[PDB]
């Protein structure tokens, strides 16, 4: 039965300062690398990761590392 | 102190059996494209992919 | 754009994904899938030190005539924002799939957005998805006569919509 895979572009531990400090549209710096290491998570758990790829109707992550 | 934020760009509500026939080199379709900031299982606001980074629009925390 | 720098897997569609989301590696190997960066290194080389062109004027990396990847993603980004500004090109661009939008970005790399906009009849046939007719017509041009190996690769990209002219 249903289980929600999440495709997480980026993760960051944040506290309130930076949290307000970004609720104001501050640029959170990513690498250009970003889309090659997309993370796949299910329940707040890290199953694997990979590379954003296109198949022009849809996006896909091609798996690099899994479990 | 700190809050882990996932910047999520889509989700694919899979089910049971596929994991784990899933393996290296396979591709997972993003069947729902989004652009969202979670803290744990809680939706905060919409961000979007820009410049050389990200900007988070509303950020609702309560 | 980060979006338009992505690797792209030209699967004809409708896909038969396993249970709506999974596509096995063994199935994808049935393809050649690259990104535009790799497409243009084939066509324009990658040179980490200055050299000076066929024309020539001195150039470096991938086809950056001055007077690498980060400098390539600059130029690509500057290619599309160009196309999107141009009034003949944007409609066709907006209209195409992603492998074919790379072929168009490729032409603009070789010959400029004004040069490409000047392909009015081939451009019409690409907006109408008349792929054979476009290919026949592009093959008539001077572009073709003057850089035939590279023009054939880019015409193959429009006719087919696959990256297969670059498996070599």
Curated annotation (Swiss-Prot), chain B:
It comes from the Bacteria. Involved in a secretory pathway responsible for the surface presentation of determinants needed for the entry of Salmonella species into mammalian cells. Belongs to the FliN/MopA/SpaO family. This is Surface presentation of antigens protein SpaO. It comes from Salmonella typhimurium (strain LT2 / SGSC1412 / ATCC 700720). The gene is spaO. The chain holds residues 148 to 209 of 303 of the full protein.
UniProtKB/Swiss-Prot annotation, chain C:
Coiled coil: none annotated. Changing residue 122 to V: 50-fold decrease in enzymatic activity. One of its GO terms (biological process) is peptidoglycan catabolic process. Changing residue 44 to Q: Complete loss of activity. Changing residue 44 to N: Loss of 84% of enzymatic activity. The active site is at 44 (proton donor/acceptor), 53 (proton donor/acceptor). Changing residue 63 to A: Almost complete loss of enzymatic activity. It holds the Pfam family Phage_lysozyme. GO terms for molecular function: lysozyme activity. SUPFAM superfamilies: Lysozyme-like. Induction: Expressed late in the viral replication. Changing residue 59 to E: Complete loss of activity at neutral pH; covalently bound substrate. Its EC number is 3.2.1.17. PANTHER family: T4-TYPE LYSOZYME 1-RELATED. Belongs to the glycosyl hydrolase 24 family. This is Endolysin. It comes from Enterobacteria phage T4. The lineage of its organism: Viruses, Duplodnaviria, Heunggongvirae, Uroviricota, Caudoviricetes.
């Amino acid at each position: 039965v249903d289980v929600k895979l999440e495709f997480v572009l980026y993760r960051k531990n944040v506290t309130l300062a930076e949290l307000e400090a970004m609720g104001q549209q501050q640029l959170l710096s990513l690498p250009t690398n970003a889309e090659l290491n997309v993370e796949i998570m299910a329940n707040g758990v890290l199953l694997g990761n990979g590379e954003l790829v296109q198949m022009n109707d849809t996006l896909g992550v091609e798996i690099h590392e899994w479990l | 102190l700190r809050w882990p934020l996932r910047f999520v760009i889509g989700s694919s509500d899979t089910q049971r059996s596929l994991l784990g026939r899933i393996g290296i080199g396979d591709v997972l379709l993003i069947r729902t494209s989004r652009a969202e900031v979670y803290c744990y299982a809680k939706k905060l606001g919409h961000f979007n992919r820009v410049e050389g980074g990200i900007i988070v629009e509303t950020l609702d925390i309560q | 754009g980060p979006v338009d720098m992505l690797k792209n897997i030209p699967i004809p569609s409708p896909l038969s994904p396993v249970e709506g989301i999974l596509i096995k590696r063994k199935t994808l190997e049935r393809y050649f899938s690259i990104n535009i960066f790799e497409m243009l290194r084939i066509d324009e080389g990658l040179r980490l030190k200055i050299y000076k062109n066929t024309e020539g004027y001195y150039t470096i990396g991938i086809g950056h005539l001055l007077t690498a990847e980060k400098l390539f993603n600059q130029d690509v980004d500057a290619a599309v924002r160009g196309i999107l500004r141009n009034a003949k090109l944007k409609p066709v661009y907006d209209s195409l799939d992603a492998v074919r939008r790379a072929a168009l970005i490729n032409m603009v790399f070789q010959m400029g957005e004004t040069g490409v906009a000047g392909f009015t009849n081939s451009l019409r046939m690409l907006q109408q998805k008349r792929w054979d007719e476009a290919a026949v017509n592009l093959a008539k041009s001077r572009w073709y006569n003057q850089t035939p190996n590279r023009a054939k690769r880019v015409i193959t990209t429009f006719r087919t919509g696959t990256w297969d002219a670059y498996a070599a």
